[PDB]
Design a protein around this nucleic acid. Structure first.
Ligand code: MN
Ligand code: MN
Ligand code: MN
Ligand code: MN
Ligand code: MN
Ligand code: MN
Ligand code: ZN
Ligand code: ZN
Lengths: 163, 365, 365, 163
DNA sequence: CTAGCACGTG
DNA sequence: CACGTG
DNA sequence: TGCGAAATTCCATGACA
DNA sequence: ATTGTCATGGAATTTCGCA
DNA sequence: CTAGCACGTG
DNA sequence: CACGTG
DNA sequence: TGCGAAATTCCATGACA
DNA sequence: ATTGTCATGGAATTTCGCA
């Protein structure tokens, strides 16, 4: 009933394990619901601790109303609940064995996994170092359904690194 | 010989006729209401003025008074000031009585990421083995990122900025000429990403004012939060960084976060006015805001200010002068006036240099 | 309960009737041109204002904006400022936006030796094993003595001043609160000679301005004379001291030596106007001069200055605050106003203290 | 033909040897001609060197047109001449075996020697320390021929230490 | 009261 | 040895 | 009894801390 | 329970030299 | 960029 | 190791 | 369409260097 | 071959609530 805004929901999963690039094995994927903006964080494991550490970075920049995830141990710990409560973030969960992201996000992690794959092919253990560029692309790829890329939706400006 | 004609009742341009000039004890004198003074030849006045001056290396009137205790000649001060403009010792040691031009209030960067400002706060009381904070302020918005480092390294700057560029790449990055910003390692890191490095004029932190001024609210908040408590600032940086990016600037009536996104995140007392609007309907309004913002005007020029002119003789403040050492380099020439507050000169080491007029004085006389 | 009557169409002083107040989701709201805001009970406003404030420990309007993103109640700023005047963290950390009163231009001491000014210059580049200079400026004249010492000892001060008192004994000796001046050894040395010790307010060198300003012309001359030359200032002190005592002050049109003696010594460019006069005829004129001198007027009070009133709540600048430590002591009370620029307070350690308003700010709110 | 001023002539002799008070044996006496103002300087010997050192102190405060002395080796050295020349001071000498000071000065060194004597009696080896006070008295004793003490003639003001 | 320190470049 | 003032 | 030039005075600025 | 000061050099102003 | 140092007192 | 900038 | 109070705005001051 | 800035709180001002 109310038009969707950035920060209204942040979606996560992990994507791993991957080949050890400089010591990092998993990747915490954060995507904004409305803009489709994406933050990646290389973590050494999909523990709540690596998750908290990474989101502690994000939640310095912005804080979402809802964090939507699946039922990974990383996301369903008592700790993680206590973590979200302190910051006023609501935790919504996808029903187990039934991903309930959204069309925009569905294609987004699609776009990310497809993006990540190229790196495994091209750069066998240099993927870590390139997470920023990936993140740039993901945030600079245009959109069909919307005429805009996230970097225009999140900031309202053309990027100085378009794709 | 020039004075011989005075004694022959002849008029000489500058020597008033009404006065009686005469000889006494081998010297030409003149009865003045001041008293009886000596009129030395032109050939000795340069020496006399030098003699009087070098007593205390005194200024104009202070040197004139000395001379006028004994001598008189037409336009003494002309013969005085001529040497003042050549006593290197006074030129390089004496302070200026001219205030700089009025400050520029440069146009606020148009969009976010148009220009970053970067600076280092520190050293600080070691918290978690960290000492410095790399502050990154976005020009347009003021949205600020705070990265803790162990040293003002080139390394720590890149290793932090990469995390930031991940979000977005900025056109220009502005900063003082600190070692980590002026290094080749960084210059090149910027080139990989098509980032243009802008550099503030040296010994002029107000040029990085955007960030220095943010340094205050950062330090000031840190201070309030550590009252009656040990100084462990590391665990507080994010807290501050969020807290500050969402703190209204009463003049604008917007917060840096707002200026960057157009909507509040899930922070306390979050503004919900755009909740009815669509993102487009709300993203349009943000484009208007960013332009319809407030722009400080250039302040009135000081009653006795000085603005630099090409070719004009000027000197540059000595950076760290030793104890009992002159605070001004020898006079240099103005090559190019970048603006009423910035100048290219020809420095004392025979180099091209861009300095703020704050570190210049117009060479007197 | 107070809000219950609003919903019963009853008017309550401060709640404008024209507005429609109602209930929604367990909260009393009000449709404003601002938007729809919540009217919390009085019992929760103190907490709410505290909640908003503690985010960035923001000032008035910055805290108001936060609250006005959600709530509305009559005279929010009153409920805001009430807490601002009690958040110790902000009171002790925030800077002042009030400039001090305009400076006093105290009457120049009437005769020579009415008041000395003493100060220490240094440390300096070791010359002849010496590091400091004890400067003694005569109040009335400005006649200055320069004594080289190895340390700012009480000893070196006495061992120098005895040579000076040999010439004459001064009524008052003025000085900052440097260890050598505040020691019992010196206090007592002054008592033997019926010298009254005057002491400048702490962390306020302009109170010893007479001498500090002389420190300049001393350092400045030393600098000019050591250009392109090692820093051996010891052998030059007398040279400077003579040179300076006989250097005209253009405003007065007299030199310190002149003001002290009424005639020039055998120095270069010596004024001979009183040569016809007898010493009496010339000593009379000197009494007229010393009185007919020039007196600087008190400058205009700053557009937003503050003058101290007895009983008023004020705080004292922390001398050396540590890194990330508040720069203001807790609020103190004004006990006695010695003058529009000097105050006796009750310091943070429960002591009587005399401070210059330069190191005070009026406690805000 | 021109009325006498302070600094117009400074008269010197030594007065010594005296009992070793803290190491000082002689005393260089400087007296201003016109005011009768007196400066004493304890020197370890009446060499030109001690004389120069002491006058180097005085000539920081004021510089006299003439320095008038007797023909002591201290005052007639080539050095001392070169010393006075550099500062523009003229050196006048009393004819040997014939003191040519002046009435004011004659009585002054009289007043000083009489003053110094009291110290030898009272304080056998503490005279050094009291040179300042002596100097104060000498400069604060009134005068017959003139209604004033030197400290009023040299400065034009009443002293804050009168006698 | 003014000395330090850090960094990166020849 | 710490604190105040410089 | 005025006019132009020259000498004096004013005064903001900065440094001493 | 003490207090800003003054050398400096362009500019503003007053004074001076000559009718 | 901010740490020092000096001194004299409990 | 010294110099520049901070 | 005016009046008093309340809310907003102005802005000099200081700190970041 | 670059450029001061902004949170702050009394005061000045503009706006608001009610006729
Ligand atoms: Mn998963
Ligand atoms: Mn810096
Ligand atoms: Mn001092
Ligand atoms: Mn003899
Ligand atoms: Mn001092
Ligand atoms: Mn800085
Ligand atoms: Zn000079
Ligand atoms: Zn607070």
């Amino acid at each position: 009933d109310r038009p969707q805004k950035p920060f209204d929901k942040f979606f996560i999963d992990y994507i791993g394990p991957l080949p050890p690039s400089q010591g990092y094995l998993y990747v915490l994927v954060v995507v904004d619901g409305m803009t489709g903006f994406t933050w990646l964080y290389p973590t050494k494991a999909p523990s709540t601790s690596a998750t908290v550490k990474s989101l502690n970075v994000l939640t310095s920049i912005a804080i979402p109303k809802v964090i939507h995830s699946d039922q990974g141990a990383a996301f369903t710990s008592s700790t993680f609940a206590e973590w979200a409560k302190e910051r006023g973030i609501h935790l919504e969960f996808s029903t187990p064995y039934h991903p309930q992201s959204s069309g925009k996000v569905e294609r987004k992690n699609s776009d990310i996994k497809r993006l990540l794959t190229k790196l495994l092919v091209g750069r066998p253990t240099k993927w870590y170092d390139l997470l920023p560029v990936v993140q740039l692309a993901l945030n600079n790829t245009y959109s069909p359904v919307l005429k805009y890329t996230p970097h225009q939706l999140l900031f309202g400006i053309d990027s100085n690194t378009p794709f | 010989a020039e004075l011989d004609q005075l004694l022959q009742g002849h008029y000489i341009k500058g020597y008033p006729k009404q006065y009686t000039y005469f000889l006494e004890d081998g010297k030409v004198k003149v009865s003045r209401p001041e008293g009886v003074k000596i009129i030395p030849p032109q050939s000795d006045r340069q020496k006399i003025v030098l003699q009087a001056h070098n007593l205390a290396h005194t200024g104009r009137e202070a040197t004139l008074l000395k001379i006028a205790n004994l001598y008189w000649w037409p336009n003494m001060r002309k013969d005085v000031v001529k040497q003042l403009g050549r006593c290197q010792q006074c030129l390089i040691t004496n302070a200026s009585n001219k205030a700089s031009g009025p400050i520029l209030r440069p146009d606020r960067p148009q969009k976010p990421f148009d220009k970053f400002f970067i600076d280092y706060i520190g050293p600080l009381p070691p918290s978690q083995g960290y000492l410095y904070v790399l502050v990154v302020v976005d020009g347009m918005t003021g949205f600020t990122w705070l990265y803790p480092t162990k040293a003002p390294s080139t390394s720590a700057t890149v290793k932090s900025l990469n995390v930031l560029t991940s979000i977005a790449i900025p056109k220009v990055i502005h900063s003082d000429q600190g070692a980590a910003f002026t290094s080749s390692t960084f210059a090149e890191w910027a080139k990989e990403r098509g980032i243009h490095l802008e550099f503030s004029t040296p010994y002029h932190p107000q040029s990085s004012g955007k960030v220095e001024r943010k340094n205050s609210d950062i330090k000031r908040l840190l201070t309030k939060l550590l009252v009656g408590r040990p100084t462990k600032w590391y665990d507080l940086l994010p807290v501050v960084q969020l807290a500050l990016n969402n703190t209204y600037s009463p003049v604008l009536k917007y917060t840096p976060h707002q200026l960057l996104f157009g909507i509040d995140s899930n922070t306390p007392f979050a503004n919900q006015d755009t909740l009815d609007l669509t993102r487009e309907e709300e993203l349009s309004l943000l484009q208007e805001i960013r332009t319809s913002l407030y722009h400080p005007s250039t302040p009135p020029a000081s009653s006795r200010s000085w603005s630099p002119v090409v070719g004009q003789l000027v000197q540059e403040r000595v950076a760290r002068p030793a104890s009992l050492r002159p605070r001004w380099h020898k006079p240099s020439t103005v090559l190019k006036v970048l603006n009423p507050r910035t100048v290219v000169i020809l420095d004392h080491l025979g180099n091209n240099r861009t300095v703020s007029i704050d570190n210049l004085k117009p060479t007197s006389h």
